[PDB]
Amino acid sequence: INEEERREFIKHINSVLAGDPDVGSRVPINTETFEFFDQCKDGLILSKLINDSVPDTIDERVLNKQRPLDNFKCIENNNVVINSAKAMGGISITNIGAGDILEGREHLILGLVWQIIRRGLLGKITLDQFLRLPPEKILLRWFNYHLKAANWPRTVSNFSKDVSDGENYTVLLNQLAPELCSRAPLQTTDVLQRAEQVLQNAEKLDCRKYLTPTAMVAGNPKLNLAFVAHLFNTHPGLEPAEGEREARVFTLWLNSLDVTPSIHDFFNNLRDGLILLQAYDKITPNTVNWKKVNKAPASGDEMMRFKAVENCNYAVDLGKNQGFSLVGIQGADITDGSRTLTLALVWQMMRMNITKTLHSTLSDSDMVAWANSMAAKGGKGSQIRSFRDPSISTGVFVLDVLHGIKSEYVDYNLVTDGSTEELAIQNARLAISIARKLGAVIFILPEDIVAVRPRLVLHFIGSLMAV
Numbered sequence: 359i360n361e362e363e364r365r366e367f368i369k370h371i372n373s374v375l376a377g378d379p380d381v382g383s384r385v386p387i388n389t390e391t392f393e394f395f396d397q398c399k400d401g402l403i404l405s406k407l408i409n410d411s412v413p414d415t416i417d418e419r420v421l422n423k424q425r426p427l428d429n430f431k432c433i434e435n436n437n438v439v440i441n442s443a444k445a446m447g448g449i450s451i452t453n454i455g456a457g458d459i460l461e462g463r464e465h466l467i468l469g470l471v472w473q474i475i476r477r478g479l480l481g482k483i484t485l486d487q488f489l490r491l492p493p494e495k496i497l498l499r500w501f502n503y504h505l506k507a508a509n510w511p512r513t514v515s516n517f518s519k520d521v522s523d524g525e526n527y528t529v530l531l532n533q534l535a536p537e538l539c540s541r542a543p544l545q546t547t548d549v550l551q552r553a554e555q556v557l558q559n560a561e562k563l564d565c566r567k568y569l570t571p572t573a574m575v576a577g578n579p580k581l582n583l584a585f586v587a588h589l590f591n592t593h594p595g596l597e598p599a600e601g602e603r604e605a606r607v608f609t610l611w612l613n614s615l616d617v618t619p620s621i622h623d624f625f626n627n628l629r630d631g632l633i634l635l636q637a638y639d640k641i642t643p644n645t646v647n648w649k650k651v652n653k654a655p656a657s658g659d660e661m662m663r664f665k666a667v668e669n670c671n672y673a674v675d676l677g678k679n680q681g682f683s684l685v686g687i688q689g690a691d692i693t694d695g696s697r698t699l700t701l702a703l704v705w706q707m708m709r710m711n712i713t714k715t716l717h718s719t720l721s722d723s724d725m726v727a728w729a730n731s732m733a734a735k736g737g738k739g740s741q742i743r744s745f746r747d748p749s750i751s752t753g754v755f756v757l758d759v760l761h762g763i764k765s766e767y768v769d770y771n772l773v774t775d776g777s778t779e780e781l782a783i784q785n786a787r788l789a790i791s792i793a794r795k796l797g798a799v800i801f802i803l804p805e806d807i808v809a810v811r812p813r814l815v816l817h818f819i820g821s822l823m824a825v
Contacts, residue, residue, distance in 0.1 A: 411478025753785030
């Protein structure tokens with residue numbers, strides 16, 4: 359484990375949890391000991407970090423809040439941590455399970471800590487495509503935009519070697535605020551001293567965060583990325599519906615299957631058929647004969663059209679073989695980026711997976727019937743006609759379903775009548791966090807239930823049938 363990463367990460371956690379009512383009794387965590395990992399065992403600190411990175415991910419009222427907490431309660435809390443992390447996007451957590459957190463696995467925990475911190479670095483918001491790129495691909499263009507403006511011959515393509523001598527940072531800071539930061543550090547020969555001078559120039563903008571002189575010279579990818587992220591949030595230095603949701607949900611799902619170039623633009627990243635073909639293999643090993651597949655051009659250019667169409671025609675047939683309903687869809691439709699048909703094909707893949715995993719002939723009506731049976735076990739809302747039923751908007755039905763699965767998890771004193779959009783979203787957010795506490799893998803947001811997006815509601819119910 360890296361000494362600085364541990365120290366700095368804990369420091370960041372200390373300031374974020376500062377005076378938190380629930381974990382306040384331990385906030386000031388030592389930056390030089392195991393202390394931290396033991397403090398992470400009951401999932402509270404991690405759950406808090408998750409909500410700081412992406413606000414409202416976890417309805418904290420589902421967490422057990424006693425600081426010696428028995429293993430059983432720590433596992434429930436850790437289920438919420440693990441399953442929330444899986445749905446935030448940009449995070450990869452396969453090597454870590456609720457039990458790993460309970461045991462204080464240092465590498466796994468610190469690994470998850472970094473993923474959570476990294477996911478929160480930029481915060482909120484073709485430009486629409488640009489803003490969905492990972493942190494590194496938004497900051498590099500930015501960093502370079504300035505170095506180019508500063509007429510500096512150097513360019514940045516990473517946050518390790520390219521920033522490790524302190525020169526690019528010095529020019530960047532001087533370009534961002536000519537009045538407080540000069541290019542004088544460029545004249546310092548000792549690189550370690552230059553790094554310190556650069557960070558002192560950072561304090562003038564209140565941006566001396568995460569990075570240390572030694573971490574800079576060492577080219578630590580994480581600490582340097584975080585440093586640049588914060589500088590970007592405070593000193594940009596720049597002079598002045600249902601379809602989209604399904605796309606984002608499907609993107610999280612497919613990425614969860616670990617397809618190579620993670621997806622950041624659903625309506626363009628599946629055109630050469632490679633992502634879809636990988637998914638088929640991840641779901642059913644040995645399904646794809648890769649000797650018949652056209653590979654992405656090493657040159658970086660777009661695959662030739664006829665080659666992408668062949669790849670997509672193959673993807674569609676593998677779907678037909680598996681029982682998918684794709685009668686009106688063709689390879690070329692996917693290659694040309696058909697919104698409706700690309701969503702339809704991925705949906706069939708997600709839908710069939712639900713049927714098969716729940717088998718290890720499940721109709722939509724069968725799922726609605728299962729959901730109603732569960733909800734009728736002391737529920738407060740109403741039975742539903744189908745996953746398209748408007749009543750689902752209040753978010754009460756989903757809480758009733760959960761109440762049927764585990765009555766103890768649903769305290770109706772915490773359930774509103776969802777008479778307003780805000781109250782409905784709170785019911786939905788509570789339902790999602792409760793489902794995660796049960797171990798459910800959910801890729802939707804509260805708004806998908808409140809707006810009653812049928813396919814997304816079915817995905818949620820299907821995840822519950824599998825806990």
